[PDB]
Amino acid sequence: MRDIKTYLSVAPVLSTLWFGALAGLLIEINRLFPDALSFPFF
Amino acid sequence: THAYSKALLFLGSGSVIHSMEPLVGYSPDKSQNMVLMGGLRKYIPITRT
Amino acid sequence: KGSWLPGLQSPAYLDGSLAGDNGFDPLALAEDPEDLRWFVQAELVNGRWAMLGVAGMLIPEVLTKAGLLNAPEWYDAGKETYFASSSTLFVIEFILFHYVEIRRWQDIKNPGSVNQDPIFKSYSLPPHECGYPGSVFNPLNFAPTLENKEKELANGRLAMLAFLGFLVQHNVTGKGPFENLQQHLADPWHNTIIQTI
Amino acid sequence: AGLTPCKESKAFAKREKQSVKKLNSSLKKYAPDSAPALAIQATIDKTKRRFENYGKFGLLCGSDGLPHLIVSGDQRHWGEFITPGVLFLYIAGWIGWVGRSYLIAVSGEKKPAMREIIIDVELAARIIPRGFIWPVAAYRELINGDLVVDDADIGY
Amino acid sequence: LFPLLILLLFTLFIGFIGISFDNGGMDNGIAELTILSKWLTPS
Amino acid sequence: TVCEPLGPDRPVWFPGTAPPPWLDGSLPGDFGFDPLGFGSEPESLRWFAQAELMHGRWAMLAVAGILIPEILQKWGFMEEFSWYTAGEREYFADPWTLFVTQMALMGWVEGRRWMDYLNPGSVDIEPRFPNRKNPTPDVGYPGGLWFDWGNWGRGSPEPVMVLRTKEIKNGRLAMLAFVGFWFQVVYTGQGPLDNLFAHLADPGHCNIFSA
Ligand code: CLA
Ligand code: CLA
Ligand code: CLA
Ligand SMILES: CC(/C=C/C=C(C)/C=C/[C@@]12O[C@]1(C)C[C@@H](O)CC2(C)C)=C\C=C\C=C(C)\C=C\C=C(C)\C=C\[C@@]12O[C@]1(C)C[C@@H](O)CC2(C)C
Numbered sequence: 116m117r118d119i120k121t122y123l124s125v126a127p128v129l130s131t132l133w134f135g136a137l138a139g140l141l142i143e144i145n146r147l148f149p150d151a152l153s154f155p156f157f
Numbered sequence: 158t159h160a161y162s163k164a165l166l167f168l169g170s171g172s173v174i175h176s177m178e179p180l181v182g183y184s185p186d187k188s189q190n191m192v193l194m195g196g197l198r199k200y201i202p203i204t205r206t
Numbered sequence: 207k208g209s210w211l212p213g214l215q216s217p218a219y220l221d222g223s224l225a226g227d228n229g230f231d232p233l234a235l236a237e238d239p240e241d242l243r244w245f246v247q248a249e250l251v252n253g254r255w256a257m258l259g260v261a262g263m264l265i266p267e268v269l270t271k272a273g274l275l276n277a278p279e280w281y282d283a284g285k286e287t288y289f290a291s292s293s294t295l296f297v298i299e300f301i302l303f304h305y306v307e308i309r310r311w312q313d314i315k316n317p318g319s320v321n322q323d324p325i326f327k328s329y330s331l332p333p334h335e336c337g338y339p340g341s342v343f344n345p346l347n348f349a350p351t352l353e354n355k356e357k358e359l360a361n362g363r364l365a366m367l368a369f370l371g372f373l374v375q376h377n378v379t380g381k382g383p384f385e386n387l388q389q390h391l392a393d394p395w396h397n398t399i400i401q402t403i
Numbered sequence: 404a405g406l407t408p409c410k411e412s413k414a415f416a417k418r419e420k421q422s423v424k425k426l427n428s429s430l431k432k433y434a435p436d437s438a439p440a441l442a443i444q445a446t447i448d449k450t451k452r453r454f455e456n457y458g459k460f461g462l463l464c465g466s467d468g469l470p471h472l473i474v475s476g477d478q479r480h481w482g483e484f485i486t487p488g489v490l491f492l493y494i495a496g497w498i499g500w501v502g503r504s505y506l507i508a509v510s511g512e513k514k515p516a517m518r519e520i521i522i523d524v525e526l527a528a529r530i531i532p533r534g535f536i537w538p539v540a541a542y543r544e545l546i547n548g549d550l551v552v553d554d555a556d557i558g559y
Numbered sequence: 560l561f562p563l564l565i566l567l568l569f570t571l572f573i574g575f576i577g578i579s580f581d582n583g584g585m586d587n588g589i590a591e592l593t594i595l596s597k598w599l600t601p602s
Numbered sequence: 603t604v605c606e607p608l609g610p611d612r613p614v615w616f617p618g619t620a621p622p623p624w625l626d627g628s629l630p631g632d633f634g635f636d637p638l639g640f641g642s643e644p645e646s647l648r649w650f651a652q653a654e655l656m657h658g659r660w661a662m663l664a665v666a667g668i669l670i671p672e673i674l675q676k677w678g679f680m681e682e683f684s685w686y687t688a689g690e691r692e693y694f695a696d697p698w699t700l701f702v703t704q705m706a707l708m709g710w711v712e713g714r715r716w717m718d719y720l721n722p723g724s725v726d727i728e729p730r731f732p733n734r735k736n737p738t739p740d741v742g743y744p745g746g747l748w749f750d751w752g753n754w755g756r757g758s759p760e761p762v763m764v765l766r767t768k769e770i771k772n773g774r775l776a777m778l779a780f781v782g783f784w785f786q787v788v789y790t791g792q793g794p795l796d797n798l799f800a801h802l803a804d805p806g807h808c809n810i811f812s813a
Contacts, residue, residue: 169563
């Protein structure tokens, strides 16, 4: 079990999941704010 | 109001009796007689409040 | 002392000597002692001025809505017309503060240096404790004891929180917070952050 | 330099009109209820409200009907560079500081390469959220000179 | 002790049945505020 | 604490098979069923045990809340209609207010419980009048007359492991029941009692294969 944990902590899979989460966040932001060119908050 | 306000007191009295009953003999009028009892705030708080 | 987490062990940074210790550093910022001192002073000053500000927000609002007085909102007081124009009082503020705060900082860098009013040589100052100045600040001879520093810091932290609340609620609403309280008391369920979005 | 905002210019309106026109002409080749046609109308109103939003935030607008940023420093047009710039600088400082702190920490082991290929995800998790300190912390570092080195170059 | 505690919970809340006759006590709290809950009684 | 090692005391979930060695059978409800060996290491084992207990209790509450109102609708006085459609039922307040209040209070409670798990005994609610010595803990069974006022989890009414076995078994069953109810409503459009009676009338045909 702990072996599969140390394997999961190997940079490829960690990086893939991290990048997937980041891309999901970005595409969701783009969905909720289409075309988002300026900073119309301040 | 009085239903609960008295049932609580009866149950509390039962608890006080059974708490002090090991110190005096197993006997009514040797327990449940609050003149040789008296002062229990330090020993059993949850059944005192 | 009161670790705000009944199971977590307090880090060595916040032993309990300084007032208001609860081991409340889940990010290990002040683990360096001099930076801990820095943030102590910063929390002190922020809390004091936050108490000041939250008073100046709340009390005028209620005294105006009570009909006893008449004074604009803290945000509606800028455009108001006074005996002095904005820039004048602002530059006077700037010079006076660039005196006072730079003296404060010199005291911070050097314990017990800038003590005396350098104008006259008597009347000057009794040696102080950093963050808790001497005579001319505590005229009523209040003893700087515990349960005073703790109360100060707790009230100041809550004051900071309340001030940030004032600011963000004015952002989302632009209305008087006491009016928000009245609407709240009308129906806390129909009046909250949820409906206003 | 004469760039009118397309809240008032015309070529912007012409671009908007031509875009919605070609979209609408494409729309009339299906059932008025087909989900593809529905998404087409959705994108139509979406680009429409985009044109509207652009006509709300002082966007100075070219002589050909196109937005044009104004990064000259005047905070009047700051919702393009200054605030997003400092926001991204905050993010980048976050990342740089957290990475540097992780590495400085994990340096003290037997062969740090084994933890540089396979991250100490526990230490990584208890080091990562420190980003809120990256401006101030590094600050003190430079104050105390514990950020740079003088004549230690190779080895460590 | 469990029944003692649960009944202590009763000997304080029950007073809110006929709480008072002066505007009830609150302008909010639509849970039968000033309509005091002894409305089961005649009519 | 009684152990259930191999042998007749160990009725194996798969007859004629030696159970995994690291499955001793201490935890009530054990039968040596972990072909995936997720319980390989002890920390994972206890973590999964806690997860199992929590899931079982919550599933019991959920299946009770499904079942009882629907039957009290079918025949009882008040008619509680489709529970699966009660999620969108309209109340005094909006669902998001309910959500945030639920999250606040449950976060408070479950966080205290989380700290108790990470640090046993360090977060407990058990008053101490003088001279009466309190009970310890076995996390997952807090004890004291807050969650055991009937004095059932300690001795007299039944040897402990047997009662915990009852609990874990009924909890697994209730988990199956909840997932079954949900999956049925995904497929069919009635409650559990309705499917039940429909199966009673026509057992031979009124089934999943009825269409
Ligand atoms: C002293 C602290 C304080 C107090 C008394 C209030 C009070 C209030 N806030 Mg508020 N607020 C605060 C801090 C505070 N806020 C802070 C720090 C923020 C920024 C995150 C906000 C952001 C905020 C928004 C965006 C809105 C309110 C609104 C409101 C009002 C309705 C309550 C509501 O919608 O939930 C308040 C919502 C929050 C996010 C507040 C979170 C405050 C944190 C959790 C600390 C407070 C914990 C504190 C110990 C518990 C309350 C103390 C109180 C019983 C004395 C109410 C008068 C609403 C309003 O005006 O409509 C009527 C509204 O739209 N607040
Ligand atoms: C947090 C780690 C970190 C930090 C603080 C820096 C800092 C710096 N790098 Mg750099 N670098 C890094 C990682 C890092 N690097 C990595 C991983 C690579 C290989 C891809 C490079 C490749 C690189 C080159 C080729 C150059 C620099 C340069 C520089 C300097 C100027 C900034 C610049 O041009 O960067 C530009 C930005 C990048 C190159 C992007 C790299 C940043 C990566 C993506 C972040 C890595 C984070 C970590 C691996 C993820 C783990 C997260 C955590 C949970 C552990 C500055 C001192 C320049 C220099 O010499 O200046 C004098 C230069 O020419 N870097
Ligand atoms: C306690 C377990 C249990 C029980 C008693 C039932 C009972 C029933 N289900 Mg059901 N179901 C279950 C679990 C269960 N289900 C699970 C886990 C799922 C998810 C896959 C489903 C999905 C499902 C659908 C989609 C439908 C039913 C339907 C029905 C009803 C008609 C029988 C039928 O055609 O389905 C037979 C059920 C299955 C093939 C599901 C297999 C899974 C169970 C667990 C089989 C194992 C048997 C069990 C472990 C041994 C008995 C334990 C205990 C009851 C003694 C009947 C009342 C139908 C309905 O609505 O009635 C009209 C229908 O359309 N079920
Ligand atoms: C909230 C705040 C700081 C909060 C920081 C917190 C909680 C940090 C917490 C942490 O670091 C710790 C503890 C430990 C870490 O491991 C975890 C985190 C979480 C990182 C400061 C507010 C500080 C707020 C302050 C100082 C407010 C001052 C207000 C003033 C002076 C008001 C002035 C006015 O009202 C008048 C006077 C007159 C009016 O008319 C006009 C104006 C000008 C508006």
